Structures are given as structure tokens and as C-alpha cells.
Design a binder for this molecule. Structure first.
Ligand SMILES: CCCCCCCC(=O)SCCNC(=O)CCNC(=O)[C@H](O)C(C)(C)COP(=O)(O)OP(=O)(O)OC[C@H]1O[C@@H](n2cnc3c(N)ncnc32)[C@H](O)[C@@H]1OP(=O)(O)O
Ligand SMILES: CCCCCCCC(=O)SCCNC(=O)CCNC(=O)[C@H](O)C(C)(C)COP(=O)(O)OP(=O)(O)OC[C@H]1O[C@@H](n2cnc3c(N)ncnc32)[C@H](O)[C@@H]1OP(=O)(O)O
Ligand SMILES: Cc1cc2nc3c(=O)[nH]c(=O)nc-3n(C[C@H](O)[C@H](O)[C@H](O)COP(=O)(O)OP(=O)(O)OC[C@H]3O[C@@H](n4cnc5c(N)ncnc54)[C@H](O)[C@@H]3O)c2cc1C
Ligand SMILES: Cc1cc2nc3c(=O)[nH]c(=O)nc-3n(C[C@H](O)[C@H](O)[C@H](O)COP(=O)(O)OP(=O)(O)OC[C@H]3O[C@@H](n4cnc5c(N)ncnc54)[C@H](O)[C@@H]3O)c2cc1C
Lengths: 599, 600
């Protein structure tokens, strides 16, 4: 049964990253008192454990049901959503201006961490909505905010992002949905959008589609794309679901997992829409909706490692099979618990290193998001903004990739039993698999990080982070407790920058290099980020243990996980380095027609 | 694009790389495996796989199996397909002539199995499990027992199961508690519940022959007390046909992640009549003819998953237009470039390709050993082939399943979002693949078998058979210009493999936890090392065919390019596995069990 990691969320927020100081230093956070944060975490935890976690298996077994009239969600989904609404969770991290509580985004993200762990398919309904707000908030006219945002902040209305068509997913410049301008200055949108998460459902009073379309004589490619508000129901005089717009769901997908989230073919038959933001600047505006959900999807990766660990640790202490290699440890039982086996511990510690490591990186990133939304200092916003732009793609691709690995360790620990539906471990793997495909594929994210962010800033995007690491190795070089962490961390911090330079050099001779190195580089970057977060959690752990503490075992575990990370996981860097220095030719020399001559 | 048998690559591996013509002529009873007959059987094999079973793979996954009190319904088309397969004589192919068989080599029967598992693994488990229980009756059954059970299994009229697992025990068979009470007439009565029995009950055959692990009434504790019993669903009648219903029933089937089409049964034996096969209390010894077949059989499942991901991905990579090459549009007449222009898509393609073609080479290398163990009359050769199988069998099962799962996941990644959708079949490949690392011995258990039972128990001798072959290859080709670039790293790695074995040994002397701590890393390293040899050898062969002039230049140029990719982008994974296995057991054993979950 899902148990929220509140003690670990507090370790990371309060002790490692000084979230009380951060909230004190920052406009809006006077109502975000330590005691109020703790009560909101504990309220969040209870909803996640008692209301949505028990629906997770229901959602997988039932999925959603299509008919011409609309889409039924699994038993208990909408009734949990009504309770989510009535608790005012939707309004937590939105402007007091448009009906919100004004608490920071980073406190919103802690609630999303627990929602995603408990029931990801259910959490996507509120999750997508949270983004369309961030879109309306950043680019909507005051009247658009008054009509649409107020309703999303209350949760009475839900939001989607409608980009994808059959022929285009990464290549949005090829999109072909049309916005035809009308005398009254509104548009009629004609097109078929596919894979639309939460496109049709029975959870809310209305749905607000944020749709990418093209104006009749716009330029080709991205520079021809505009953003439209297309609600399922056009508002009435009081602002409530009014006239039924010509938006309908023609079908939902049969998928490997995330069955409880309706994945919809949305047909727009000259549906009334309103332009939001400048004509042909839709891609620019949509990237508010996208970088929310990039960090929101990095959260999915964290959730799959956490669920995989919760299951693994429980089964490894309860399942008896075979005996310890150093003699029977439970001779009064017919077998030893499987935790006594070194490989089961390797699998448990892998999931633990990834869950706790990525939790640190995620709430480090979330502090940057708060700064960009609320700081007055433009030096401090701009340094936060460049840090988000470096960490966003790393977090999304790296946390999902190792989250899916972590989910598979969970299954492996159960042996055969892991393949069987009733234990929920195999559902975790199935739900994890989409996280590396949507919200920018691993490959597209890697290309974004290395080409657009790092190589296009001639390495400056990396320097923000390698600065913090270099300052840690200097302040802690002669700290005896983390000597063993600082040495290889300093070495890796150097190599990180060296590799960045060698790849820029290779790329100057052959552009194919940016692609050839990209995923290897992003994965290396991910292990290097977590090397720093584990060296720092180890530093904090050693500080607390030397000062005496009610929780000896808590901090000794942090040191033991850090050492596992450095000695057993971080050396995967060696293969990422070798592959990325090998050059583009070993990928590009084979002719397309020569890949499958063995038939 | 539907399933296409990789016959051209299967021929390259057996005929060109592994000398299968000369091997078959050097073996007693292999005179009927003429090159033209093998090629005829391979063609008929592919026809059956591509036309009868491959179309049923989606149906198997959508319907799965339907339980009722009376029986277990199989997916639409499966039993009719099993009839055409019986009518084709396929079950009889690699079995002895006197018991209904055609007497062809096991390594020919394995080529058919390669194509069956790629076409529809769930369906292939039905005959594939039969193939096991036949091998056990051959090895350990009385001539009477072979007359009744082995003849029906060789015809395919009856199917066979392996019944080991119970709720409390899968790896630890010593704890099993299924009982066998002696009866006055020399038969036994088996009472107990077995779980996760593949093909335990279905509607495809006239009878099912269970090979059951059970305990005699005063047997010693542990594996020393396990005996092996034939328990048929229908007791034979006087003619030798399905007679009296035995007290064997299926209480349920599991709901699973995958292989929905293969019924996974809770089998209740209610004092069912069984017959002791093999000595009393030597069950586990006898049941290991069945288990090693099924381990090289499960390695083949790993190959199958890599193959299916490759066939889907290459077709989609050439048809899907998304974005443009980094070096300017390669298809400017089209609205976007094929995704194969992107280096990362080529990286996923070539990963699946290195693993499929490398593992195929490893598999038929192993299958030549099976053939020598079964047929050779030279003892020195039987001993060396037996010893080579002992080393390769767990490497093949664990490595090929693990890199098979990776390869299936690359397949989905190439389709992007579309790969998560049921219609394309790529996500089923991943879900079917996941069981392959759990059953027939877990990755962790095969890794302990390799390092603990075979390698360290022989003080490194089990490794020598293979390192010898690799060292002779590096000497034979030190001066060979076309492959010098493979030979150098191969010889460095072959030496390191021997050094690592000794160091792990030294570490285990001080701390026995080191055997489990190094096990999976050591098996994965060993896997990568085996494929480094096979890619080097396939690169040598391709150089030799190109220097001599061939009408298939591209085919041989593609082997060199894949071998170079394997060496430069995949083999370096050994770096991670070396560092992990030399890190020590303390980084895994120091954390007390009660301190693993203190964040709640
Ligand atoms: C929570 C559950 C998840 C469910 C959601 C499912 C997924 C979805 O909703 S659809 C996912 C959306 N798609 C993706 O994320 C990946 C596919 N699209 C891409 O990212 C493509 O690479 C794509 C379309 C951006 C390429 O466009 P292209 O015009 O070549 O980009 P580029 O020239 O680099 O940038 C164009 C403009 O976009 C914006 N932009 C691009 N990248 C970024 C970025 N990383 N951050 C911010 N803005 C960006 C900028 O305004 C930029 O302007 P400029 O060029 O002057 O800097
Ligand atoms: C094609 C269709 C595929 C479908 C797959 C579905 C089928 C299944 O999943 S059923 C198979 C699942 N069962 C297993 O694999 C059980 C797991 N196995 C194990 O853990 C061990 O091998 C086990 C329990 C059998 C032996 O345990 P233990 O007694 O501690 O081993 P050990 O003492 O070293 O050896 C016991 C005896 O078994 C035999 N044995 C052990 N290992 C091997 C081996 N690798 N090869 C051959 N014989 C072996 C020997 O006879 C040995 O006796 P001795 O040591 O005197 O030679
Ligand atoms: C779909 C399916 C089909 C099956 N078909 C059959 C069949 O036809 N016939 C049959 O007899 N069985 C069958 N099985 C059972 C299957 O072989 C077992 O699941 C397998 O042997 C593992 O046993 P277990 O699941 O009980 O895991 P356990 O043995 O409990 O192992 C659990 C975990 O502990 C680890 N572990 C255990 N001991 C050690 C050790 N000493 N060192 C290190 N790690 C260790 C394992 O590696 C694993 O990670 C089937 C299973 C499934 C799921
Ligand atoms: C369950 C689900 C829910 C979804 N929900 C939504 C939603 O709510 N809203 C929405 O708008 N979309 C949604 N999508 C669509 C999703 O965002 C796309 O699937 C995703 O962007 C990938 O696009 P694609 O599937 O068309 O693959 P493609 O873009 O065709 O990519 C295919 C392959 O090519 C690779 N590739 C493509 N271009 C390059 C390049 N330049 N360099 C390197 N590799 C490249 C990719 O990495 C991938 O491996 C959803 C999809 C799914 C499966």
C-alpha cells in the first residue's frame, strides 16, 4: 500500500536545500510558514494514500470507455476528483488574483510528487490542467484569464495541450490543423489531433483545449504555428459551460499502460477558438505549457523508482528463498529473507540511489522555478533561468530512463511473482514506459540539451552547475568524512567540461556528432548531477552524525547509499564517455538499404 | 511489415561462420541432414512461422486464455495451428528414430525454434515445453515409459509440462512439499499444488504429460529428497491412448503482464497416479536434462525479442519522416527526412542489430556442442563440448534475455509515442520479453550458477575452454590487416577476463558475499566478451569473403560496420561491470535490513 516518503521529502527540502530560508527570501512566501507547509504536505499525503492510491489498480484493469457521447473514467476516478476540487488542491500554486492560494510552485511540486506515485494516470487529469494555466497566465489577455484561468484554478474545468497529429509529433512545423479567422475576430479550427491526454472524460464541467494551428497564409514550419483556446463548452453569460463547441472524441487508444488516462483522437469541425499570444508565435507561447510538464514528467521518472523501491523493500524482507552465502541468518525459518542475497541488495540500492538522488535534483530545480516566477533581482532570475534550461532536459530524460530501470528492478526482486498483475509491480513498469516517449522523447531531449543549450552557448549553460560542484569540492576537500566522494567528484567535474569541449570540436568537423553524442552526453550529465547530490547528502549526513542526532540510522543510510552510488552506479560514466568519444562514423557509415540484408 | 524469418543470417551463421556442413558429416546419425534437406526444412519452417503462427501473435495477446472448472480455452487459431504443426511432423524432427522421430540433429530443431519464438513465443511454449519432457524421458525413462509417453510426445499428439514451482518456492526447490505415496502396484499417488505451470491445461492436444517434482515419505531434507514423477492428465488405456481421467485439474490461470496466449496454471494433484522416473531422491539430477534444454531454449527467447524489435524498428525508421538530417535535408523532395538519418535512431537500430546477430552466432556455436554431447563417440570431444555448454548455457540464458529486453525497448523507442500503442506489436514484444529474465532461472540465479558453481568451483578452469578459442583467434589474426582493429581490444579483454576471474576468486577467499556481489556483473561482462569474439570472427569472415569477391558485398560490408559499432559503443559497458565487481561486497552488505526504508 502506497506510503508517502514525507521524512525523505523533509530531508531534501528542509535540511539539504534550506527551503525555510528560500521561502523567507522570496516575495509571496510569508503565508508559507514551516508549520503550514508541514500541514499541507501531511494533508497531501493523506489524500494520496487514502483516496487515489487505492484506485491505481482499478484504473489499470478498467481503463476508460469510449462512446459517441463521451468517455467514462475508471470506477472512483471522478469522485476522487470532486474530493481533490473540494480540498482546493487545484488552486494551491496560482495567483491570489485569479482565485488561487498564491503558495509557491515548489510546494505544488511536492504534492505532485505524491500524486504521481499514488496514481499517475489519475494525476495527469489535474497535471495537464496545471500547465494550461501556466500558459493562460503567461500569454492570455485579462479577459481570457477571467473566463478560462479562474475555472482551471478552481479545478471545475480541466485543460489539455493539443499539438500531435498522425504525421507529426516531434516535427510540429509540419502540423496542418487550420485556424480560419472570423469577422467577430474569433477562429474556426478544423483538424484531427491524436494522443490527446484527458481530451474527453466525465471528471469536470468543461475542458479547455490549448491547440496549435496555422493561420491561412502563415509561413512554413514552426514560424507558421499559432496557439488557440478551444473549450468543449463555450462560456455562457455567467461564465459557465454554455453552448457545445464542435470538438469531439472519435476514439481512445489501446495502450501498454496508463489505461486510466483517456488518450483521445480529438476532431475539431470548425470549432470556435480564440488566439492566445501573438500570431505565428504559438511555438514560443506553448513552451510555458511544455517546460512545466518537462519537470512534471521528470516527476514521473521519480515516481516509478519510488513505487519500485516501496514494493521491493517490503517483499525482500518478507520472501524467504535460499540461504546467505555466509551461513543461515534465520536458521529458525525454512529459508533466509531474500534481502540477505548481495544481488537483491544491489537491486534495492539501485532503486534507492535513483529515488533519493532524483528527489534532491528535482527540489533543487524547483527552487529555480520559484526564483524565475517571483524574484525581483534580474541577476538572480537570469541565473535561475539558465539553470532551469540546463537541468530541465537532464531531469526529464535521465529520471524517466533510470525510473524505468528502477521499475524493472522492483519486478526482478519479486522473481516470477513480479510478472503477475495482482502485485502492481508490472503495472509500474507499463506506466513507466510512456515517460521516455512523451513530453519530448529521450532522443529529442538529449539533442535539446547538447545542441541548443550547451553547444549553442559554447558551454556556458554547463558552467552554472559545474561552478556549484567546484565550490563543493573546495569547501569540503579537507572534510575527512566525504574525502572519498570529493576526489572522484572533482575529477568528474573536470572531465564533464573537457568532454563538452571535445564534442564541440568534433561537431565543428562533422555536425552528425551533436546527434552521435547527444544521449550518451545527457546520461553522463545525469550521473554527474546525482554524484554531486549524493556527495552533498553524504556531507549533510556526516554533519548531523558528528553533532549528535535522534536519527543515527537515517543519516548512516544516506552515507551507505552515497557510497553505493559512487562505486557501483557512477562508473556507467566510463561507457557513456567511450561511446561519445567514438565519433559519428560508426553510426553513419552503414547505408539505409544495408541494415536488413539477413532476410 | 509482418514477421520475416532471418534465413539469410541463419545460413551465414551456420554454413559460413560455424562450418555446419562439415560438423554434420562428422557426427553419427547426421547423414540425413544433407545441405539441401536442411535448406528445404528451413524454408518449410519459415513458411509455417510467417503464414500460420505469426498472424496469431496479436490474437494470443488480446484474448489470452479462458479458464473454466472443466478446462482452459486457448486463443482463437492456436489449436488449429497446433494441428497443422502436428500434421507437418515438426515435433518429431529432432527425436530418435525408434520412438517415432526423424532423428535429425538438435541444432536443426533449434533453427525451427528460433523462427517459432520470433513468430509467436506464447504459442511456441506449448511444443517447446513438450521438447523438454521428451529429452527427460529419453535420458532417464524405462523402455516401457518411453513406449507409452515418449512416442505420443514425439508425434505431438500429447504435450508435456515441467511441474517444479509451489507458492513458497521457485529458486529454492529444496523446500518443495508435493508428496508421492507408494501404492501396492508400484505406481504412486501425487498430492500437492503446483503454481505457474506453463501449458498446465489447454485444449490443443489429446493428453498432457506432467513431469512433477515430489517427495517420497521418508526422503532426506532439501534437494537430496526430491524425486521425479510422470503424472498424465489421462492415464493410458490398453492400446496406449488417452483413457481414465487422472486426478489432475487446473484450479486457475494467472493474469500476467504478457505471454497471455500461454496458459499459466495452478495445477491441483489430488492423489493423481504417477510413475517414478529416474532413481528415488535423484529427481533434481534427472530434471536438469529438461532444465538446460529450456535454458538454451530461454536464451533463444532473448534472441527472439531482439530480432522482433530490429524488424519493427528498421521498417519504421525507413518509412517515418520526422525532422531533417543534421547535415542538410537528405530527402528535400519530401516534407521531412526518414528518421534513419538521425544518429540516435541509427544507434538504437545498430544496438538491436549487434545483439540479434551476435547472439545468433553465440546460439549456434552452443548448439554445435549440444550435438557433440548427444552423438559423438569420442570421449575427449564429448567432455570438452559438455564443459563448454556448462559455461555458455547460463551466459546465453541471462545475457541474451537481458539484452533482448533492452533491444525490445529500443524497438518501441524508434516508434516514439506510436510504440506505446497495442496496434504496432512493439509494446507486446516488451511485455512478452519481461518474463524471460524471471523464469527458467532468474538472472541473479544464472549469475550465481556461472560464477559460484562452474567458474570458482573449477578454480577458473570452466572459462579456459572459451578463452583458449579466443587466444588462438587473436594469434591467427594478429597480422590480418582487415581485422587488426578488433584483434587488439579482443586480446586485451580476453586477458582481463582471466585476471578478473582470479581477483573475484581472491575476494571470495576473504568474504563469501563477494560471489553474489560480483555474480551478475561477471555474467554481463562474460556476455559482452563472448559477443566481442563472435563479432571479431564474423568481421574476419566478411573480410575473407570480400577479398575473394562476392555477389553480396553489401551483406558482408554490413557485418564489418556492425562489428565496429559493437566494439566502439557497446563493449565499453564492460568498464562499468569491472568497476562494480571490483568495488567489494561491503557497499552492498553494510546497510542493516531495518535501515533501507527510513524516509516514510
Ligand atoms: C504530464 C503528462 C505528459 C503528457 C503530455 C504528452 C506530450 C505532449 O503534450 S506533446 C510534447 C511536445 N513535444 C515535445 O516536447 C518534443 C517535440 N517537439 C520538439 O521539442 C521539437 O524539437 C521542436 C518542435 C521544438 C523543434 O522546433 P524548432 O523550431 O526546430 O526549435 P528551435 O528552433 O530550437 O526553437 C524554436 C523556438 O521554440 C522555443 N523553444 C525551443 N526549445 C525550447 C526550450 N527548450 N525551452 C523553451 N523554449 C524553447 C523558443 O521560443 C525557440 O525560439 P528561438 O529559436 O528563437 O530560440
Ligand atoms: C521453452 C519454454 C520456456 C518456459 C520456461 C518456464 C519453465 C520454468 O520456469 S521451470 C524452471 C524453474 N526452476 C528453476 O530454474 C529453479 C532454480 N534453480 C536453482 O536455483 C538451482 O539450480 C537448484 C535449486 C535446482 C539447485 O539447488 P542446489 O541443490 O542448492 O544446487 P547444487 O547443490 O549446486 O546442485 C544440486 C544438483 O543439481 C544439479 N545441478 C545444479 N546446477 C546444475 C546445472 N547448472 N546444470 C546441471 N545440473 C545442475 C546437479 O545434479 C547437482 O548435484 P551435484 O552438485 O552433486 O552435481
Ligand atoms: C509466466 C511464468 C511461467 C512459469 N512457468 C513455469 C513452469 O512451467 N514450470 C515451473 O516449474 N515453474 C514455472 N514458473 C516458475 C518460475 O520458474 C519461477 O518464478 C522462478 O523459478 C523464480 O522463482 P520465484 O518467482 O518464486 O522467485 P524467488 O525464487 O522467490 O526469487 C525472488 C528473488 O530473489 C532472488 N534470489 C533468490 N535466491 C537467491 C540467491 N540465492 N541469490 C541471489 N538472489 C536470489 C531471485 O533472483 C529473485 O530476484 C513460471 C513462472 C512464471 C512467472
Ligand atoms: C500516451 C500518450 C499520450 C500523449 N499525450 C499527448 C498530449 O496530451 N498532447 C500532445 O500534444 N501529444 C501527446 N502525445 C504525443 C507524444 O507527445 C508524441 O508521441 C511524442 O512527441 C513523440 O512523437 P511521435 O510519437 O510522433 O514520434 P516521432 O516524433 O516520429 O519520433 C520517432 C522517433 O524518432 C526520433 N527522432 C525524431 N526526430 C529526431 C531528431 N531530430 N533527432 C533524433 N531523433 C529523432 C524520436 O526520438 C523517436 O525515437 C501523447 C503520446 C502518447 C503515447
Amino acid at each position: 500500500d502506497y506510503k508517502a516518503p514525507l521524512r525523505d521529502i523533509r530531508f531534501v527540502r528542509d535540511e539539504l536545500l534550506g527551503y525555510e530560508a528560500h521561502y523567507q527570501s522570496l516575495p509571496g512566501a510569508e503565508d508559507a510558514t514551516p508549520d503550514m507547509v508541514n500541514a499541507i504536505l501531511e494533508e497531501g499525503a493523506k489524500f494520496c494514500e487514502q483516496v487515489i492510491a487505492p484506485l491505481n489498480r482499478v484504473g489499470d484493469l478498467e481503463g476508460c470507455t469510449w462512446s459517441a457521447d463521451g468517455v467514462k473514467t475508471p470506477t472512483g476516478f471522478k469522485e476522487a476528483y470532486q474530493q481533490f476540487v473540494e480540498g482546493g488542491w487545484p488552486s494551491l500554486a496560482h495567483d491570489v488574483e485569479h482565485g488561487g492560494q498564491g503558495l509557491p510552485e515548489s510546494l505544488g511540486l511536492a504534492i505532485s510528487e505524491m500524486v504521481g506515485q499514488a496514481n499517475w494516470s489519475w494525476g495527469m487529469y489535474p497535471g495537464l490542467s496545471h500547465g494550461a494555466m501556466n500558459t493562460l497566465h503567461a500569454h492570455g489577455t485579462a479577459e481570457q484569464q477571467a473566463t478560462y484561468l479562474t475555472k482551471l484554478v478552481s479545478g471545475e474545468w480541466t485543460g489539455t495541450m493539443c499539438l500531435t497529429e498522425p504525421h507529426c509529433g516531434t516535427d510540429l512545423g509540419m502540423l496542418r490543423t487550420k485556424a480560419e479567422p472570423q469577422a467577430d475576430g474569433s477562429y474556426k479550427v478544423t483538424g484531427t489531433k491524436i494522443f490527446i491526454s484527458a481530451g474527453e472524460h466525465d471528471m469536470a464541467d468543461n475542458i479547455v483545449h490549448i491547440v496549435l494551428a496555422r493561420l491561412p497564409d502563415a509561413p512554413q514550419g514552426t514560424k507558421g504555428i499559432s496557439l488557440f483556446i478551444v473549450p468543449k463548452f463555450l462560456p455562457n453569460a455567467e461564465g459557465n459551460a454554455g453552448e457545445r463547441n464542435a470538438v469531439s472524441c472519435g476514439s481512445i487508444e489501446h495502450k501498454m499502460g496508463i489505461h486510466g488516462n483517456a488518450t483521445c483522437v480529438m476532431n475539431f469541425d470548425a470549432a470556435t477558438g480564440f488566439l492566445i499570444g501573438p500570431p505565428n508565435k504559438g511555438l514560443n507561447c506553448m513552451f510555458t505549457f511544455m517546460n512545466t510538464a518537462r519537470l512534471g514528467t521528470a516527476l514521473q521518472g521519480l515516481a516509478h523508482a519510488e513505487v519500485g523501491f516501496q514494493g521491493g523493500i517490503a517483499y525482500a524482507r518478507e520472501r524467504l528463498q535460499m540461504r546467505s552465502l555466509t551461513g543461515p541468518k534465520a536458521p529458525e525459518k525454512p529459508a533466509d529473507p531474500i534481502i540477505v542475497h548481495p544481488d537483491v541488495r544491489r537491486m534495492l540500492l539501485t532503486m534507492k540511489a535513483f529515488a533519493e538522488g532524483n528527489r534532491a535534483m528535482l527540489y533543487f530545480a524547483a527552487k529555480q522555478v520559484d526564483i524565475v516566477q517571483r524574484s525581483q533581482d534580474e541577476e538572480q532570475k537570469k541565473a535561475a533561468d539558465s539553470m532551469l534550461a540546463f537541468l530541465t532536459p537532464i531531469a526529464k530524460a535521465f529520471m524517466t530512463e533510470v525510473g524505468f530501470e528502477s521499475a524493472n528492478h522492483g519486478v526482478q526482486i519479486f522473481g516470477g511473482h513480479g510478472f503477475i498483475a495482482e502485485h502492481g509491480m508490472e503495472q509500474n513498469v507499463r506506466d513507466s514506459r510512456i515517460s521516455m516517449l512523451y513530453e519530448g522523447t529521450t532522443g529529442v531531449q538529449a539533442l535539446d540539451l547538447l545542441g541548443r543549450k550547451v553547444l549553442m552557448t559554447q558551454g556556458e549553460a554547463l558552467k552554472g552547475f559545474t561552478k556549484i560542484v567546484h565550490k563543493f569540492c573546495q569547501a569540503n576537500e579537507a572534510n575527512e568524512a566525504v574525502k572519498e566522494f570529493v576526489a572522484p567528484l572533482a575529477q568528474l567535474n573536470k572531465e564533464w567540461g573537457d568532454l563538452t569541449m571535445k564534442v564541440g570540436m568534433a561537431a565543428m568537423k562533422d555536425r552528425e556528432e551533436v546527434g552521435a553524442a547527444s544521449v550518451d552526453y545527457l546520461m553522463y550529465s545525469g550521473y554527474a548531477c546525482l554524484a554531486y547530490f549524493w556527495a552533498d547528502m553524504a556531507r549533510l549526513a556526516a554533519e548531523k552524525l558528528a553533532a549528535g542526532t535522534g536519527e543515527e540510522a537515517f543519516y548512516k543510510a544516506k552515507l551507505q547509499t552515497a557510497r553505493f552510488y559512487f562505486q557501483r552506479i557512477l562508473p556507467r560514466t566510463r561507457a557513456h564517455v567511450a561511446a561519445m568519444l567514438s565519433g559519428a562514423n560508426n553510426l553513419m557509415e552503414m547505408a539505409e538499404e544495408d541494415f536488413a540484408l539477413g532476410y
